[PDB]
Write a protein that binds this DNA or RNA. Structure first.
Ligand SMILES: [Mg+2]
Ligand SMILES: [Mg+2]
Ligand SMILES: [Mg+2]
Ligand SMILES: [Mg+2]
Ligand SMILES: [Mg+2]
Ligand SMILES: [Mg+2]
Ligand SMILES: [Mg+2]
Ligand SMILES: [Mg+2]
Ligand SMILES: [Mg+2]
Ligand SMILES: [Mg+2]
Ligand SMILES: [Mg+2]
Ligand SMILES: [Mg+2]
Ligand SMILES: [Mg+2]
Ligand SMILES: [Mg+2]
Ligand SMILES: [Mg+2]
Ligand SMILES: [Mg+2]
Ligand SMILES: [Mg+2]
Ligand SMILES: [Mg+2]
Ligand SMILES: [Mg+2]
Ligand SMILES: [Mg+2]
Ligand SMILES: [Mg+2]
Ligand SMILES: [Mg+2]
Ligand SMILES: [Mg+2]
Ligand SMILES: [Mg+2]
Ligand SMILES: [Mg+2]
Ligand SMILES: [Mg+2]
Ligand SMILES: [Mg+2]
Ligand SMILES: [Mg+2]
Ligand SMILES: [Mg+2]
Ligand SMILES: [Mg+2]
Ligand SMILES: [Mg+2]
Ligand SMILES: [Mg+2]
Ligand SMILES: [Mg+2]
Ligand SMILES: [Mg+2]
Ligand SMILES: [Mg+2]
Ligand SMILES: [Mg+2]
Lengths: 96, 67, 227, 106
RNA sequence: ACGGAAGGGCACCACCAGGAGUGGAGCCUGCGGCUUAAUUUGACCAACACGGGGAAACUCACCAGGUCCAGACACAAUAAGGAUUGACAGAUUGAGAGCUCUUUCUUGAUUUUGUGGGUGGUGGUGCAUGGCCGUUCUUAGUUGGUGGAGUGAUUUGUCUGCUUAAUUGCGAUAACGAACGAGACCUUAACCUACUAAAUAGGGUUGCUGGCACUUGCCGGUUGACUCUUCUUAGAGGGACUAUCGGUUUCAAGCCGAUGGAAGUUUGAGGCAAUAACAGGUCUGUGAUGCCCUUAGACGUUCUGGGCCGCACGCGCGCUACACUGACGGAGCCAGCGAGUACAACCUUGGCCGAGAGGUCUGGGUAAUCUUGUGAAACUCCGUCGUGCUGGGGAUAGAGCAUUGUAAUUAUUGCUCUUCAACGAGGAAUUCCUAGUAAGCGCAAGUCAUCAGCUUGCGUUGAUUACGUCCCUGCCCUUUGUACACACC
């Protein structure tokens, strides 16, 4: 997919700062939620990342659950050039 | 077409054979006895059991019967 | 959030269906059994009953965490207002869902169909169940379809005893030549079935009478009078 | 200084009965324990949520339908009761399934 | 398994006695055939108002065309002196499409062209499959463990009788104990002046008033007070178990009648509902799916328009009718299931307009609160009509007014005026049904932006005739015969 690099930057940076996406299956919608970009290339970008081996996908009731695996974290950190001591929001020990 | 299938007949037979001194001729007293001395799950089955128990009691009172 | 109460309950039910199917998709490798949705004044607790609880939690307790995040975005919840909880199944033998998933996994590894089915039945009856049954339908080593039936104990079929005691589970297994359909039925022990009836509808229990001695004819035994 | 009675109202919902009735009974017991005046757990007509559905997913076969339904029981309660004990009662004794809602109506 | 073989039992998807019908007519809808670019397709008791299939767009699957990649990933290849992307204006187009061209400008490694591979597919195969449902079969039928008989396939248990709706029981017994089915069980409908209670349900007394009567009474209004739960609700419970009695029964299972009852058909109605099976249907519900096909001008996806509705013709559900037990006017005025707006715009009261459809202004209702007492139709009372295809019938058309809709022509639908056709109770034949049942009558809900003549439910008025049989069509068990086992097709 041909994604302008700034919208792809938004996608990658959001996926990193928290770690998960839902991405309703309905294409052609104007804006994906909490991303302010088109849902279509959100879905396609996470599909490409999964094909890489960085995002585990899970389709159920059209809501494309996305989760970031460790090599995904490393790849995003190298791409986002953010310091190597910050982890996505999932890794935070928000336990019981 | 009321035939009172296996369960009620066997239960009433055991009821008579284990509790004849306490059983009576009356349906309501034997109904309370069935409630107290046996754990019948529903209440329609309890009523059928008490009714057949009363019938068997009446037959026994008339005379000695098989089984 | 204002909405009709009947519509609110329907939405709650469809949300529970949401959660159950999503967890079935995700935690299938975990021997998923069931999910409970408890609603408090502040938190929407979601208890997960699964076999591999420690793997469900994951390292440092992050897996559950990210799962929670998905829910918070699946239903537009708020942080803190929702929280997951992973619990071990009370007895993995009795839950037909877990057995169905486990023996689907066994089928996935090319294990013998008859051997896997009989092992499942044996384990279930070992758990204390009053009867188990498994239907394996599909292309069992032949082009023509056929259904194999394995059973032991007794399985009722009519009346809500079918709902009160026997629990069923249906699964699909993907092989290199087609799909196999798997149906698992377990009739739990009614005596141990809490929160409901504790016996079959026609199960009649008669209390054994106590034996007493009557011979004492006069027996005017006197207590000390009180006033 | 919350002596002003809020004439507060507690309403309930569920798709099941025994736990709903249990919650209502506990609410009434709590209300009587601290000497509160009330209108009892007034029963509301159980709304039957019904869908008819054709059984066959493909239209073939003899015409066979089915009806699925829940029942919703409401059993609202209102209290002419003090402030803090009432809110404590609402925030305690909660059972999954039964849904509690509170209206001040003051 | 079958018998135009026997015995014993059953069923209004059988009949008798009937009722209402359909088949005759218009129309609506679904098939076939024809036609067409397409008139998309699957079903042929158990296909045909069925796929929730009431499709104007979408739906969609068909047709004439126009777009785009929503071809991940790996490698090679170009390539940062441009891999590429996009576009004003014009030709082109149906388009205000940079689809394609004229010119040029913009854009930056996401891409582009080749290989592998992958996805998408209402593409094919239900004769590869799952799941589900239908049917065999609404009948009462199945099964294995020790034991007996057979060399054996198999058999007895599962039966001579009687009884039951029932392999339901009484029993007799090479059978004994058991399991599934039936029953039991849940929902629903009754009955509860017994309990708990209620300004989201009702009632009484008394206030504050209205009117009429004049005697202190009647019919009303008030969210003023006190009190109650008979009805209305819904929880725990009670109640019927063929209870008592009389007949009849190897006197046992049980049947028949009367009485008391609310209820005596299993109390009515259902929901689940066994073994075995069908090459029954569904890939067109599924991101359920194996294989095969396609994967760039695509069978992917989207846009425009058309079709799924055509019409020499046959058939299947129905609706309106052929009138006097009626049509049309007024007046009376009676329900029960429902449903109803939030990130959207639902149910609509009430007040003004319009003759109506409808319009407008406000106000309730996220619901025992408001629509709503859904003041519904049939029905009832008084009149007009008067046996005339007539004031029946309202199809087919002409014109106009509105609503939903981006869009209504191939009339969406509603309303107003007019033409008013066939239709005279419908052959052979054939369907459904034994009590609040059939039938008549409508209302609600699912389809729904608008549209039902459909279906699922609900209630109103409410019967004639059975209360039996194996004669037709079948079903269950037993006996017998068979040259049948793809099993009398
Ligand atoms: Mg049973
Ligand atoms: Mg049953
Ligand atoms: Mg017939
Ligand atoms: Mg006849
Ligand atoms: Mg007719
Ligand atoms: Mg006709
Ligand atoms: Mg005809
Ligand atoms: Mg056609
Ligand atoms: Mg049939
Ligand atoms: Mg239409
Ligand atoms: Mg189109
Ligand atoms: Mg179309
Ligand atoms: Mg085209
Ligand atoms: Mg598809
Ligand atoms: Mg397509
Ligand atoms: Mg088939
Ligand atoms: Mg059957
Ligand atoms: Mg043997
Ligand atoms: Mg036999
Ligand atoms: Mg009462
Ligand atoms: Mg007698
Ligand atoms: Mg019944
Ligand atoms: Mg076939
Ligand atoms: Mg396909
Ligand atoms: Mg059609
Ligand atoms: Mg039909
Ligand atoms: Mg009239
Ligand atoms: Mg009403
Ligand atoms: Mg009316
Ligand atoms: Mg005329
Ligand atoms: Mg007329
Ligand atoms: Mg009529
Ligand atoms: Mg229809
Ligand atoms: Mg009969
Ligand atoms: Mg032969
Ligand atoms: Mg012949």
């Amino acid at each position: 997919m041909l994604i302008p690099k700034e919208d792809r930057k938004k996608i990658y940076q959001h996926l990193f700062q928290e770690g998960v996406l839902v991405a309703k299956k309905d294409f052609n919608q104007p804006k994906h939620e909490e991303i302010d970009t088109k849902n279509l290339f959100v879905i396609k970008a996470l599909q490409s990342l999964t094909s890489k081996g960085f995002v585990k996908t899970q389709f159920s009731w059209q809501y494309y659950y996305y989760t970031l695996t460790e090599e995904g974290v490393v790849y995003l950190r190298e791409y986002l050039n953010l310091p190597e001591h910050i982890f996505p929001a999932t890794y935070l020990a928000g336990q019981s | 077409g009321r035939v009172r299938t296996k369960t009620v007949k066997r239960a009433s037979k055991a009821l008579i054979e284990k509790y004849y001194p306490k059983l009576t001729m009356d349906f309501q007293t034997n109904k309370r006895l069935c409630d107290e001395i046996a754990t019948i799950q529903s209440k329609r089955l309890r009523n059928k059991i008490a009714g057949y128990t009363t019938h068997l009691m009446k037959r026994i009172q008339k005379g000695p019967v098989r089984g | 959030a204002i909405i009709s109460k009947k519509r609110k309950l329907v939405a709650d039910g469809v949300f529970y269906a949401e959660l159950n199917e999503f967890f079935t998709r995700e935690l299938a490798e975990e021997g998923y059994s069931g999910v409970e949705v408890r609603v408090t004044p502040t938190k929407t607790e979601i208890i997960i009953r699964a076999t591999k609880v420690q793997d469900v939690v994951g390292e440092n307790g992050r897996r559950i965490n990210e799962l929670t995040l998905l829910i918070e975005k699946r239903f537009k919840y708020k942080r803190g207002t929702i929280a997951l909880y992973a619990e071990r199944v009370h007895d993995r033998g009795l839950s037909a869902v877990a057995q169905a998933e486990s023996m689907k996994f066994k089928l996935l590894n090319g294990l013998a169909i008859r051997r896997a089915a009989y092992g499942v039945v044996r384990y279930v009856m070992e758990s204390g169940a009053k009867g188990c049954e498994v239907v394996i339908s599909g292309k069992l080593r032949a082009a023509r379809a056929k259904s194999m039936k394995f059973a032991d104990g007794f399985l009722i079929h009519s009346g809500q005893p079918v709902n009160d005691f026997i629990e069923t589970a249906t699964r699909h297994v993907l092989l290199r030549q087609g799909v196999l359909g798997i149906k698992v039925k377990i009739m739990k022990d009614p005596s141990r079935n809490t929160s409901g009836p504790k016996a079959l509808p026609d199960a009649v229990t008669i209390i054994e009478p106590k034996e007493e001695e009557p011979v004492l004819e006069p027996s005017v035994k006197d207590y000390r009078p009180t006033e | 200084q919350e002596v002003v009675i809020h004439k507060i109202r507690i309403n309930l919902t569920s798709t099941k009965v025994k736990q709903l009735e249990n919650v209502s009974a506990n609410i009434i017991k709590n209300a009587e324990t601290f000497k509160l005046v009330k209108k009892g757990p007034v029963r509301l007509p159980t709304k039957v949520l019904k869908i008819s559905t054709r059984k066959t997913p493909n239209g073939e076969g003899s015409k066979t339908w089915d009806t699925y339904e829940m029942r919703i029981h409401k059993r609202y309660i209102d209290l002419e009761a003090p402030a803090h004990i009432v809110k404590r009662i609402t925030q305690i004794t909660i059972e999954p399934g039964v849904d509690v809602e509170v209206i001040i109506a003051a």
